[PDB]
Amino acid sequence: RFLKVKNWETDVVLTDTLHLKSTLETGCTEHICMGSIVLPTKDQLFPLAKEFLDQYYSSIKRFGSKAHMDRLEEVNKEIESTSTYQLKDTELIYGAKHAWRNASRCVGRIQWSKLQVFDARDCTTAHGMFNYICNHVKYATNKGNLRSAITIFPQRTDGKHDFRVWNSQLIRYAGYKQPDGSTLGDPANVQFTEICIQQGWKAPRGRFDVLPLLLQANGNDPELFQIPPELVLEVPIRHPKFDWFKDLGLKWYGLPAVSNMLLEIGGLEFSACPFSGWYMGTEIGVRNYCDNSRYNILEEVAKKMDLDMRKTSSLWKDQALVEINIAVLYSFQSDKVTIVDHHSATESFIKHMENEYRCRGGCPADWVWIVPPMSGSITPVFHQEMLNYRLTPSFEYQPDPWNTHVW
Template sequence: MTYVDSWTQSDPLRRRLRRLTKGERREEAIDFLKLYHHELELPPADLEKRTRAVLAELQRTGSYTHTTAELSFGARVAWRNHANCIGRLYWKSLEVNDARDVTDPDEMALRVIAHLGKSTTSGARRSAITIFGPARDDRPTAYFDCHQLTQYAGYLRDDGVLGDPQNVEATRSAIALGWQPPATPSAFDLLPFVIRDATGPRRLYELPPGTVREVDIVHPTLPGIASLGLRWYTVPLVTDMILTIGGIDYPCAPFNGFYMATEIASRNFVDQARYNLLDRVGDAIGVDKADPYWKDRALTELNRAVLSSFNAAEAAIIDHHAASQQYIDFVRIEHALGRDVSGNWAWIVPPQASAACPVFHLPMTDHHDVPNFYRTRAIDGAALRSAKLTEQRGRTLRRVDRIKRRLRHWLRTRG
């Protein structure tokens, strides 16, 4: 069922998109084409021909259209470049669904529901992305107006929040758009998702029964955790990230990976701004809170419960030690190929047993290379730029690049 709100004059998407000059868009397009042809070892004549065609299209329209092969390569490299993700070892296996021809919100909803359903039923550690149309200066585009396709409601009450506090505003909006919560609300009520269409109105879509698979969280030896009635959905499908490839932004590109157990156990269930369950978990397993390490034990057992529950349900998940080792393997492979790796230490290092994970001791730098993903230009989009990995550039040219980037950043911040 679809619910629609009234149109407003504001354009939230435009405030999030990167601001590129014609020269910057041209530069990113050329650098992307060089990277594409270099890594796929295509003939130089093909690069010259494709570059001429893209530059002519940019001159004529201010934009250009990626081929299906370029789109798939660009999405995979965007994942490879994204500094916040620990699970990039298998970036080449990203399944790319080209949905650029789909512009109707109802059809977009059907496509992403099918995406979620396929990822849910496979049970495999396979990441996928569905890419809808790019942002154009001459016309608006529809996009998802929610953080993830699957989210739990948060109901604000006099005694606090029932459910996920992160989603209190999303829950209020859903109700205002016509969603009816269950007669007896719970801490794990699935919210509908929202698409803002090209003319502004938001449309609300409820997930069909059976689309989302949830796992009840139980512990293999501590029955007290089962008494908490915890559960979580198996597939995180992120819908609010903007994909940028060669100077072209795709604001509607929902993608999924699979969970690391600490994301659910050490963050979603325990963060004070989320479910804030650490005290209740400690009570449920009978820890002595006079012990200074009771929180450590509660976190460890909750992680064990999440991991074992997902494994028992044959749902894709990974523990933080295995994920850390995979990231180390990814870095080694990339360095062997002569590529620098972008990494954000605060995102890569797991919140549980951090110093026991090899990534804790690994120096990291976010190079902000494109292609990439970003949320808004204010948070992480303005710093993105071409890496020029395929060029042999001397010290003087690299210094010129730095000066140009700083000048562009200064001009943007002034406006």
């Protein structure tokens, strides 16, 4: 019932009770753990809504109040009547901040309470959506001094009128498969980069072509839009010692903004809720630049450093890795763009975890994702036992639209 988590570096033991409010399933069972797997009705609605309001009113110290009882009845009626309901703005904001609060895979949750919420529920078209998105991008970028934000489009009705942003992030580079068999640009986006062309986009076939937004409103077909170049802040990547680094011609955008997830609040579903914070260095330096299925630049950087790539035991890949990461952080800091290094980010998460354990009774956390992709054990999260479970409100994965859309 009452589980404990120990930190093996400091011996600190914390007790977790919050998991007892868990509702969804983990993917695991008493016989098999799937901890490393990436993707493991009016009757159904009212209980969900009730759970939500109860936690909302409890949070505002008005649990079991008339206000609580009243709103509770109002939604009940509305659901029985409209088969659904609408959240007050206060509930919308609270639900959003909490879905972030509950994202077990996010290392930056110490910032959860400061989220700026943009209510875009009154949106009706793709141009509208485009307008809302440009505004989000500009507000969030804030000339390099990034601020967390989320823009929430209209909730689901009959699934046949869902709003969706086809991009996986508001800002991502294109990927083209060249005759060479090789891939130009970002391999992760190759497919999408084609679905844009299949819609009309005039790809510039470069190594870093900011993709175009493909916005879908009320279930209609998606439309393209080219984010104002002046609103997309990019950082040229240069090393603070290796002048040849700049010749690699690498650059990355300053705004990470997941746009393909689904936000669930009180049973209600929001299929279009792009959100953004700021990068942790490693996301770019390790994964985007060094994953083999991505820009895979380790060999190139290795060569330029004149390292002995003959034997893996020379740890050349590891040395190159560190440098590629030193340059990203350096480049971002120099241009005054917000970015956090894995040491600082993990330290803050540990601090956040401790606050959460004593003020909320726990903090769902996915160790496989919280531990940085480099120098794992030299960060404090490596030594921290964590409990993973699903709390609502939450951010969930959802099928790509192009594999579900009835044109």
